[PDB]
């Protein structure tokens with residue numbers, strides 16, 4: 001069971017890796033405590049197919065507070081994914097970075113947030129605006145030190161009305177607290 | 178045909194209002 | 196400001212959960228079922244629950260209740276709108292709303308939940324637009340979401356340019372037991388299935404009372420809609436300036452405009468019902484239905500629901516026209532009529548048995564509901580005048596529209 | 611059973627093999643991996659996590675898993691020891707004070723009973739400054755000859771130029787593959 005799943009996830013075949021990821025997602029959704037296998041799925045993270053990357057990101061987000069120590073092995077992957085040409089991959093990475101409830105992980109994520117703040121893609125801009133609000137809610141002092149208030153203020157005065165609305169919502173949420 | 182009233186073509190604009 | 200969007204089941208099991216803010220522990224969902232049971236059992240059950248400092252506001256779907264936990268003073272209206280958008284997206288993607296698809300469409304469901312809302316703030320809600328980025332069977336996101344026009348994908352091409360409209364009428368009448376109508380509201384519904392090539396900018400034109408008065412033609416038949424609600428494609432500024440309805444129709448069927456005004460005309464159907472219920476011996480149903488609608492119109496599938504006794508058994512029906520059936524599941528006389536010519540008069544004489552032993556508790560007086568649906572009938576008198584289909588490429592459109600009249604909240608209070 | 615498909619695959623090349631990338635931070639590991647994969651000197655930020663890539667040469671897909679030399683990541687090398695067939699060690703001759711730390715880390719990594727079939731692969735990195743030692747002084751200091759039942763090979767590669775990469779690849783192929 002668990003050993004077979006770990007062996008399947010530690011294989012070199014993508015056809016078995018996708019099935020293992022789907023089974024792990026179903027077990028977590030079915031109500032199975034799969035947080036013990038978080039380090040095993042860490043190796044099978046950098047994959048070309050976006051179908052397994054989303055599942056891995058969701059598992060990490062759902063298994064971030066449970067194993068914060070084992071989550072230290074994902075900063076490099078997030079940094080690498082924060083520069084992919086595809087806007088969808090960058091948006092997913094930005095969303096997953098802000099969803100990680102790790103006190104030792106948000107400190108190193110300031111650079112990707114600053115890089116994605118001025119992204120040309122409106123989806124990337126919206127993802128960065130959401131991640132800024134998430135980080136400010138998680139750590140207001142880190143957000144203030146990073147100087148994201150000035151970037152957020154200039155977001156409303158730019159193009160991309162969806163991105164402007166997202167920035168306004170993030171600023172309202174930050175000012176609410 | 179179709180239940181609920183047969184479909185009818187619509188105009189383009191108020192021709193009598195210029 | 197939802198903290199976690201979760202989907203439960205009829206047994207209290209959470210089919211799927213999607214945390215948005217993470218400020219609420221995932222173990223609070225366990226107390227939602229007992230809290231709902233206590234509220235329902237004491238009459239305090241409400242769609243917005245409260246587990247201490249965390250509020251569980253959600254609505255009941257076809258098979259599961261989409262309860263979304265929240266902790267701060269978030270907008271309950273925003274949460275309800277997000278839940279409605281999610282339900283609409285699921286209906287567009289999944290033809291059925293049951294547990295069979297939750298456990299079978301999790302791969303696409305998780306992706307849709309992640310993409311729809313981030314940090315409790317939704318960003319995309321168009322099923323047609325979202326279908327180009329999340330599929331269950333991924334390229335860059337379409338420019339429609341980034342562009343202002345988020346309800347009309349560019350580059351759509353079709354062999355023909357045919358748009359079918361639907362002027363659906365909802366006749367809602369609240370007739371009191373004294374025989375007078377209290378609430379008589381008719382809500383218009385203009386639903387169009389736009390199927391054209393490109394991104395045409397529809398310019399809908401009708402014989403509106405306000406428009407006729409502004410143009411100076413306030414003397415002909417004009418519909419005086421108390422409330423006119425345009426869709427997302429309809430530009431609010433254009434309608435506010437000079438009643439100009441200019442918008443880009445979407446690709447498929449969608450609700451463009453929904454008129455809503457009170458009606459001061461006589462009911463299209465007059466129902467004269469009598470109840471000669473003897474004391475535990477017998478009962479009589481002298482129901483007479485008179486069609487006050489125009490004779491040229493026929494009410495297809497007339498269904499006048501007559502609430503019969505709950506414990507009535509061995510009934511005999513003496514009617515004139517139409518099929519009358521008593522459904523034990525519903526406990527009422529279904530006055531089913533296939534075609535009802537305008538001005539028709541149907542008389543019925545009910546006769547059913549009753550047990551000698553009286554009922555332990557009262558059951559109330561359910562109202563009599565008519566399910567008449569007469570197409571090609573416009574009671575409000577509103578007629579479509581024009582529909583300006585303009586395209587940059589240039590094409591000859593063939594718009595179509597149909598008028599269907601049905602019974603909405605046409606319930607008649609019993610005596 | 612029939613092995614006709616295996617023979618047909620081996621007639622045109624079927625073996626791929628694996629490889630590991632370990633060493634101290636700022637040891638030229640990322641640059642070496644980039645040169646092996648692409649062939650250019652790419653400047654990158656320090657490896658907080660790890661880098662995974664593959665190299666296709668001589669009909670063998672040499673998959674390389676770069677591992678950083680961070681203090682908090684030094685004990686994390688045991689995660690890659692499972693299902694690992696190769697291992698390449700990159701030395702840092704430009705850090706005299708870090709030479710002892712690198713030798714201690716290599717000795718600790720060599721003291722695992724699970725990683726026994728992985729032959730030694732010593733790469734002389736930072737072969738561009740006059741202060742760099744030869745291919746024997748570093749080995750003598752590290753005592754690579756005292757590794758019983760371990761096949762070590764010292765090769766000097768210049769990060770700026772890339773010379774010696776072909777010789778190291780040929781030596782690795784000869785050590786891994788024992789056929790014609």
Ligand SMILES: Nc1nc2c(ncn2[C@@H]2O[C@H](COP(=O)(O)OP(=O)(O)OP(=O)(O)O)[C@@H](O)[C@H]2O)c(=O)[nH]1
Nearest residue numbers: 635636637638639640641654656657678736769770
């Ligand atoms: N100019 C120059 N610098 C070199 C050379 N060899 C190694 N370096 C230094 O070594 C570092 C190598 O970093 P990377 O190749 O990106 O990755 P790494 O070797 O794993 O180092 P970390 O990322 O810190 O773990 C560079 O930043 C250089 O400063 C060389 O031949 N020329």
Ligand SMILES: [Mg+2]
Nearest residue numbers: 639640641657
């Ligand atoms: Mg490196």
